[model samples]
Target: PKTLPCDVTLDVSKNHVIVDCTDKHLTEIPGGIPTNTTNLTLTINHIPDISPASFHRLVHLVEIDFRCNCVPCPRRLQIKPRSFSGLTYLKSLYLDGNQLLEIPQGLPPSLQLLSLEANNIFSIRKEQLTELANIEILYLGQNCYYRNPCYVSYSIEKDAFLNLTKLKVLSLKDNNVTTVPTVLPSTLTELYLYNNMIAEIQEDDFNNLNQLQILDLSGNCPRCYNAPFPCTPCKNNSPLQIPVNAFDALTELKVLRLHSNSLQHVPPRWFKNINNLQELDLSQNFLAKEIGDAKFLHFLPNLIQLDLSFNFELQVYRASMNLSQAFSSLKSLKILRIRGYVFKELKSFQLSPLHNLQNLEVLDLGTNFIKIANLSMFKQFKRLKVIDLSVNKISPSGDSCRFKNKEASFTSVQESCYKYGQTLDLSKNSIFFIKSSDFQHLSFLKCLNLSGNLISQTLNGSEFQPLAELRYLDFSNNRLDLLHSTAFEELRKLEVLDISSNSHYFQSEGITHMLNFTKNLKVLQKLMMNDNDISSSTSRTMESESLRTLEFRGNHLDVLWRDGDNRYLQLFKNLLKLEELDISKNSLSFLPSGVFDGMPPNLKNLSLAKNGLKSFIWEKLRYLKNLETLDLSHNQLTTVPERLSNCSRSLKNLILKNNQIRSLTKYFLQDAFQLRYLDLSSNKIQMIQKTSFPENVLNNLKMLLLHHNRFLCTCDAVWFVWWVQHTEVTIPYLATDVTCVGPGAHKGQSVISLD
Candidate 1:
């Protein structure tokens, strides 16, 4: 039974042959494809015709993907005229989103990339692209105003890309296309006319496109529109101007995106002449006044990424704008995005022109209500490496820094501007207290984002003894509750630690003194204490064997059994290099059977989901033997645990969806056998016995979610509704529409439309 027609799939190996007729239901184009088929995926098919003997036996197709279209609105896809003329060794042709209105004429002159993106193509004449002249990547972006967004206009015929001179990437993004569709082909070097309503930027509209190096006029504003709420302010018809030598002959422009665009100003000779511009996005744009120093960026002296975010009048006229000699000639500016811009303070010579950007490395003054009383104005940014003073109203001021008795020494007041900083985001910033010498001279800080922040206590454990090369630490939403057990005894190369939500500091000593200061770190590996109020005797012991992912979701781990407290089974007996363990929503109902006695045998992802745990004594997961993903979804199991065949060779993924499991046999999952992914949706399963399961359980099953369960339709479910219509696994929702509650005249039908 080597299926091929309708439901096509002839995957023959060695020396190619992959025909997969995707979503079958194909209207046409299904003529026994195998002519040594070489990749032909008719994705999501309801193939509305394409009959030139439907790929004339796939003539050794070298890639042909009819993307989308098998049904999901407006399905019109017709292509007959010599339908790809026997694919003459076709080299990539994906008819994206397919509702194609034009351009699909006898293609395949050894096509080299042609994807009619989200089609309904409005226009593009020049003999419909002069027969793709060896098309070199051409994706007509979101064709026809992205499926009639009030069907605007879209025309391009001025020698519409004049015989594709080996077209090198051309995408008319989104599209309503108002202008800039002149001749193009200067061997177009990447051009995606972003969004598109197209307002202005004329000056010979990129004259000879001099090998245009990436150009995307973001959301081309013709009186900007998208409004329904969120940051609304559009209505503008005159702003989109850009004629100061409209990109003077694209001097090999290297990335340029005029964000949103209603542009208020940026004329200092509008980028004099590209100068190898390296990434420039005039974010949002309505450039609220005050940009001086040669008006626009000092003519891209090799600009290395700059996004002038939002710009609310350049942060209310940023102290009469002199932005340190207007970004002191971007000395090789290295990533600088002036986010939001509410700049409330920051006087120390207002960032002394960003300390001459000494090779600045990422500095995004987030939100910007910045109130830097004295962080010695980032003491000359010693090659700053990532610093986004998030939300910003920064607290920085213990009367110009002071840490008495702990032998204070910020090297006499201040010098550390993140001395060679390595990632510091200070999230949400409303910080109340943090003075272990405010990050004692950053000591090469490695990722620290004081999440949310209204910081309440918990610092003095020598406040992260100079980070000791900290490796990612996020004190989530704040109000932190006492920590000091040597807080994290100098991190020890901490690796990913997020004190999630905090819940008033683990509801009064519940994360047992934060796992007694994270069992002395020892290379702590990813630990996010979710929600908080942790319990189960708040960790009696859990010395990381280099802990690998341990999240206590919605804490307060209600009673994990306690007769003579086996100290929560001695915490996690030497973790044994734990691998992902999230105690989902907790409040366990029962699990006392040596409760995973000394767990971790390389446990791989185990989440006791929502927990009112009803039963689960699978020999307490016989020492996890490399368990691979097992979330006992909302519990109350009725039966199915045959000691889940002791890890059955690393169980793949078995999430028992909202439990109360009714039945399942063939030795439950006959020793897993690398089970791929099985959900058992909604549960209380009605019947499944066709010898339960185990013919290698659908051989390496890849996704089988039995929809809302309780399924039972006469004749003992007719071999599970003919094995869910010939299983190749993947029964996402359609277990033949599950339905039938019983044999009482096949109540409510559909156990595969029960006859």
Candidate 2:
């Protein structure tokens, strides 16, 4: 069945052939297509010209996407020189947002990816692209220029890509190169000259690209052109220095990104010769001062991820006695980001050279205003697992600042970071208190971020009982209140709990102090009390039977009457693995009759959107037969509930947008045959009853949002203005601004332009 023309669209299977003429405004290239077309997308077309037999006989063409092209702005794309002459098994060629100036020569020596990104191809010369000798990925970054001194200037000539010896990924980022282009292509393995202007890299540039493994000269300056877009200010270029042996001969370098360059001083043999360097990002350089000694990483012994974050002159005080001897030769360093270092106090002999980092695992000293009185200076990070002292200023008074510290005063910081410290980010520290021996010895702590702290109260009842393998807990923007009901009773493997945005006196006792410290956290699964101010005694100290996601959005939930408050209908009676329920912007209005009795039978996603819900007792969601996503958007419903056809066979996404639904009842969506996304948009709907949605309940309606209602173009809305101009449902602004408020000459018009 190979028949593609009228707006091309072929899908042939057996193995490939995908041709999809995107935005088909095709001005050419469409002669029966399908010569076993192996994926070809003529994106956003207006195709200008590409003659030489266009795609010659698509020798099983493998990928060719002509990116953005409405071809008008001063007309461009004109390729002819053998224009892909014979697609000999062409492998990937996307002329990104074209305006082509060169480089598209016959290309297809079994080409392996070639993208002329944001093209205008200023200049390249040398063997242009020597017939793409099996080119292995090459994206001419943000081609030429797009404003700000755009009078062309991208020259490359010196050996251009030197006959692409199987070039392995090369991107001249935000081009306008100013040096550093010594022909390249020694089987280059990932090299993106970030925002070029080059500046300096000396010692034979890249030593003839010895199989370079990922290198991004971040924002090379001198006049940092478009490094990060229009951030104009590189009047003369200077910042990028690197010298020392500028990556000696790239010993198979493994990821090196010199972030926002302006180097200050790193020359301790720079990096000797990349001893199998595994990730090193000299973050936002301008290295103020120090940064050397401690044998400057003894030449990176297999370094594993090290980012000198925002090197603000790297200074670590407390009488820096070699502050862990500058990371003692990074023993296979495992992710260490020295963020904004200015360590104010970290004594214990400046952490005795991180006790020789016994295999440190993820440690980001965030915004270091650091002051770690003593957690035994983190013993010696015996494989420490994730610890980010967020916006540090960690307090440390006298009285030995008891975090109880006993077990032999934190047996070497609990055997080097509590067994295997699992994710602990003390968020924006201003931390008030948290005794209980401050995480006793992190009994395998699992994800705990004290969000933007100023933590005032809570945390007393055995402060997190030594984090019984805690599973995700973020006390959001704190100022906590009371939490003591055994305070999370030993966290029985607590699963996801975030006390959102505190303080209004902890938002009126933060969800009744987290439903009385999660009533013994029965494997609690996901519960984020959003902007807490909950009431009704926070659902009478809620109860969970394995709660599966329940967020009380912007709390202070108003009423739930069903006579004498039915205790919010026993708070989902025993959750029973309740599946997603968000009480959106509370102030609820009504939902009585057994209000979802005991919910959970897998009660699928339900949000009482921006509450104050006027009326809703849709037969109490007929036992939520897995009710699939039902958000009563901005309530005050006027109609259309009709017992929601009892669970209408798993109602698929039905959000009653900004309700006050004006009309609909013709069995309002009969039996909602698995309705697929139906938002009665900004309602006050004028009329709908023309057998109100009974085409077998809109079959499997995919998105039917009646835009900003108040319809009424007359003839009682002539079958809803011919079903909104022959409805294929998605009525965003039904033919433009969904208008028509009255009949008098169809008031504001646009109800699909009336009839």
Candidate 3:
């Protein structure tokens, strides 16, 4: 591990010495040993071979992490050019992953994070990484000469990774990248081409990734075909040419994830020379067209998230009768997801190109069909947040009769944001009555999803007194019952309190007198009671001390009383700060054993998903220790107790999706170390063996949920779809309607779910 293993007797005023030597198994290192280690970390080591007598003792190492390692072979060099020439106080150099096929010569012109990831490195020679003059985070991911038998002329001999002019986070994703590698180096800012095999990327490929800010070409395979030449439609405008060097030079791209490709129309100056684009995912795609006029996303002036979701061949321009002039030059649009009959031929609806965007947040017009104009025409969109009109169809005469024209100015969208706060997803439309001041000039309306509407009166506490920045309040499957605890008494900024599918509605007062009239909710987090009838002493006054995500699934609680001298466990131990705590299907048993003493040590997702546990006592989950997503699926567990590996290295998503365990317990998940999503769907016996798991436990698992377990089909299920189509760390389980019991059941089949 010595390209420069520092240690030169430190204290020359000790600048720095980080020395970690991760996974140390070093074959050799220790030349003079102490040139005052200046941030050296022979990471994940093997230290194959070295030269120049192994750096003969660093002059003054700067920042080095010869990552992974097997070094030697810049085309098989015997190493001499003064072997890093006495180290000369280097800056930063992380010879990443390493096996070295080429490209490592001279270096040390005050190098910077030169991470050579997964190396047996391939073509880069334009004078080979040009004398590293202060390089910056250049991680060449994977590496098989950038993948595949030299896919599409891998020959990048010019300015490769361009002389590092303070280069920023540039990871050529899963390389084998087809084209698009011309002289980038405009101080790049995060450009990871996800799983490349690029198929047609015209537009000067991205005239040097113009200061890109996260342009991950989500797993490229973008095949659209037909476009060889097709214009002359200009009337309804169905052209789509785009190649004036496409986006000229991407004026600062902003989060444009071409989600799982197959483009069809992004044309119209393809982002009119990108004037700071803001989130535009052409989701899924197939596209037919109808993003009418404004010449396709006109000049995108700070456009905010606009995912044309699913795109079942998008349609809806009905010959553009000036649909707000097709979003008049997007004056900073704020989150606008379309679909559901594309705004039913949206008319003028002008807010003047979204008036300076005042930081408009999530506004998903969920499965649209909207109507009911002038809901004060959105009271001038005061920083509106989540507003998904779930499965729409609202054409109610709630005033403003499907107007033909007129009524425009909401005083310039309320003086343009005039200090607006967020949250507002109008769940399932056709609303009834919310009149009372109807958000009196919306003074920062907080979370308010009207859960499947059909509202039934009784909300007078001055009926949301102008929502003094109201805090979460979903009515859940609406048509309410009783709630006038002064209707949240002016809502005093109410804090999370869903009604939960209001059946026969809980009369005679509940929710402990409506959470004591939400006296400023004292920072309450969440409290959703499932399928009504909340009682258990009103669930011990909702154990509040400013609660944290607590959902009571299918209520009517029989006994969840953990009385270790409870006061809701001393008000959850003085609100140490909870983080997600769901009480699955109630009527639980025995959980008083210091019931998570003092809770919140930064608690991290702990849902008894579907309660009714048969047994408990995994040392009550080793003081949680910052647990990371652990939902114990459906009730009755058979085993799973061996101290749950002390909450396995911050376990990452271990939802038992649907459960019923049987014989699975070899160090359950020893040191989970960020174990990515794992759901054990409808579990039951399984002969699973991989040495009883834990050899890199599915290797930092990126999703491994044994769907409806009980496998018998052999050949190891084709290595689980070739380990999910050759895993490069992509595991997101939850295979839609995942079904397949025992032996491919009735051939209904279905296993793939890594979403």
Candidate 4:
């Protein structure tokens, strides 16, 4: 295949010649093939090199097939115009499954179809296809270049394929290209370039591909395209310049996807020219702006779907006035998502612009920093169905002026109906009181989250009576110390309740009242009471039912009291659906096998971290087949249980930090492949056996915490030092005291012996 040989002739009258060399050891095609042969097939062979001169022997050749043979384009193969100087009658060329670096230069002008799939060809230079004027179908897909390193910004030249004017079908799939190349031919109709690293579509790059009817830019690292939307006409003295060329191009763009980008702003006047745009996606971008009446976004008449999720810095308005203006122009906008604080402030409330948007169906504003004042603001949204306002700083009533409207009529209604905001979320905030009539308007309020706050006083029946339909309430991570009688009397329909992470002082006295409230709750399914200072008295008062998941982490409670008179396990066993329990970060020294002996076998995801436990008794854990994550860190364990290896395959995370172990057994981690994170830091280990960790241990461990250990870093500790340095496992911090302990001791020397 290197050069044309003058031997081994073939008949010129033959229509086809099939050379079946399946898995042949041949290194190259002999240079002695007949020149006049019209068709040739070379399948499944080790033909390493093929020179242009080899094709010169076939003058009237119309077809050449080389499938599954040295398919990756050979390195350092030079292609010149004279390579195929003899194939004047060539029409069909199939180089599929070959190792091609590029489209061979000097393709026959009479060729109607050419396929070079599954190769290393990334770019097709205009000069390479200068003579392929008659090519109707040109396919360069499923190639090595799609996944090769040439699709980056530094690899693709601007004017690579400006001469494929006759191309009808162009395929360039599976390339990790971020930016679309410039100067694409105007005649391209069906272009396939999916599964690439395409982030954003700039106007300059895609302006000229007007004839592209089916452009596939999917599966790429899509980013937000800065398409202009009609804004309030920047009143800023120095308005951002809008390139004149931006509006004149993209008159026929049908679909535009700008997902997964770092776009911060959607400059006004971006879609002035896309008169035929059908679908647009600006999701997964960093879009944060106030979409009030004064802002732009009123001009898009054909927008269908919009996804604005996963943006961490987006701020949204809470009042009804701010959302009214921006979403008004998107009358045709079906889906809108501005999860959690898509706006920062609501300066005015002239009914906002949403008075005209009648097509908005699903609106997701979850995880925002919103605090709505009036529920009637949403009464105008007649077509609105699903609304999510999870994880926000939505307190009941502390700052009314922040959401107050400029108009007197809107402000009056908001202030009047502002008390009742059913299904409100005041989690992770510092709101102390709920005014007597604050939630009076939420007649249909169901779920409420007041977790992570400083509400020390338990709620009264009259305060929550407005939420007669309330079902789920989460008051976790609060400083609540009291629970008055009839606290949740009105919430007869309450089901799942979370009062975890509260002080234990008030919990001890409130447990009895809480049990009375739980007994009245006919549908109560879960009751999470973790991280409290509950004592044996509180435990005795907890009358469990069909509760499911109970997490008790961060509580200082150590012992579990049980007997004929005061029993904890017997109470938990009453909860038939209690499947998972967490008792991590408490003061418990060890687990008592007798306590779990009365429990159901379905308990899973047990946690016992930060306890003063010395070691665990695995014989008690054999009942937990559904156990997924076991936490045993921040303890004083001197040794590990040999039975722990039994759960190694099923265990996902094992935490053993802050322990007092001096050595480890060779088979300590014999079958610990399923371990995703293992923390062995802050221990009192001086040395480890060479076989303490399996060879594959480093491959599975995602996070390894091994700082503050008593490792004696001597010359013999080179292997441990190498493992810490070379392996991908992350050590939280290196101990300063872990230095050479012998004659070569240096006060502050690294184990590597730095100069």
- Per-residue accuracy of model 3 over 53-79 as CA lDDT, tens digit each: 665666777876665565432232233
Q: Write candidate 1's Cα lDDT for 216-334 as tens digits.
A: 88776622344442222334446566688777777887888887776777776767777888888787666656343435677777888888776565215453223636777888988
**Which consecutive 10 residues in model 4 have the weakest lDDT in total?**
400-409
In order, the Cα lDDT scores of the candidates are 0.69, 0.68, 0.57, 0.57
Task: Compute each candidate's TM-score over C-alphas.
Answer: 0.38, 0.36, 0.29, 0.49
| Ten contiguous residues with the weakest lDDT in model 1 | 400-409
Across 620-734, the per-residue lDDT of candidate 2 in tens digits comes to: 6767788889888888877566645664578789888878767777767776676788888777777777666776666568767776677677776577667666655544445
Report backbone clashes per prediction.
Answer: 1, 5, 14, 40
- Candidate 3 lands at a TM-score of 0.29
Best by TM-score: 4
User: Model 4 Cα displacement at 218 (Å)?
Assistant: 19
